[model samples]
Target chain A: MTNTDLKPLLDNLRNATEFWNLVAAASATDESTVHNRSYRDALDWLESAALALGDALIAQRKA
Target chain B: MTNTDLKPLLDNLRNATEFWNLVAAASVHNRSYRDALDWLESAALALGDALIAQRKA
Candidate 1:
């Protein structure tokens, strides 16, 4: 796909990474169990999505 | 913002990073363009993400 087609996806990725970083910082500072748990959940989801997307892109590139 | 609002953005971010990674590998293997250019562009975008997020948070 062209960069133009991918631009929106790139913007979203950038925003998501930023959001994760924000949560990471918040999770680091807050010691509450409930808060930490939510943060962990979010972190797991983000990390998984990031890795999966990365892998898929690489696989496509190779194909 | 709600998780609902953030979900799409996260998906996009993941896709972009993946795209950059692909470009990075291609640049490395082909050496047609300067490797530094690709890396620099990727890194700059990443930095932008972090900085923008920091400000918003």
Candidate 2:
């Protein structure tokens, strides 16, 4: 059995997470030059990070 | 829009993939030391790779 519990991952993804929730909830008005780009970029970065974490987790399971 | 298309990913995961299908299909008769671990581990590694690809896709 894997030593690490998946609670943190479950929590992070449970309520859609802060980054995704904000991105998904962004209004057109809320999207301005500075904030819009930053927010979208943050989302992109977070997506990449999440993918990495997910990959690691799956790998650990397989190992 | 993201230029990357997920067609390949869709294809890869469409038929449950080879590794997973094999792992899921592994029977007791086929349970051996080397082959069993190797097969399961391969399935596990492939599943991880699949997730990574799915993410990028």
Candidate 3:
């Protein structure tokens, strides 16, 4: 069965896209700190997405 | 030149593992809910792992 609750994972992918986009920049930052906040934020965003997905999935079951 | 600081990705994977281990209970006390949640989280985690591996390479 298809469900709307699954969409947070899509949002998570956006976090993933930006996160790796920085992987390219990470080295260009070449040990510089320009994108340090973005990098950590991206990683944190990913974890939040992961946490959100689990919560939403559980929420779906309750309905 | 392995100047890469992989600890963050490792930390991210640690988060991923945290999610994975919860799939068994992504449950509503329902079997179907358990299964779908199981697959989605696993797939997402695998995608994250693949990207991190690319960064590692």
Best by TM-score: 3
Instruction: Report the number of backbone clashes for model 2.
Output: 0
Please give, for residues A1-63, the per-residue lDDT of candidate 3 as tens digits.
Answer: 023544456446545755756665675745557566666766566556665654554455467
lDDT of each: 0.52, 0.42, 0.52
Q: In terms of TM-score, how similar is model 1 to the real structure?
A: 0.40
**Ten-residue stretch with the least lDDT total in model 2 chain B:** B1-10
What TM-score, computed on C-alpha atoms, does each candidate reach? Answer: 0.40, 0.36, 0.42
Question: Which 10-residue window of candidate 2 chain A scores lowest in summed lDDT?
Answer: A7-16
| TM-score: model 3, chain A | 0.55
Across B1-57, the per-residue lDDT of candidate 1 in tens digits comes to 344544444445445556555666763445533453354344434543643654566
Candidates 1 and 2 compared by lDDT, better number: 1
Tens-place lDDT per residue, model 2, A1-63, is 122443343233322334444554664457477567757675454434334334445455466
lDDT of 2: 0.42
lDDT of 2 at A55: 47
Tens digits of per-residue lDDT for model 1 on A17-60? Answer: 66666776787667698667866766554544454544544455
Which residue pairs overlap in candidate 2's backbone?
none
True contacts kept of 1: 0.32
Per prediction, the TM-score for chain B is 0.46, 0.43, 0.47
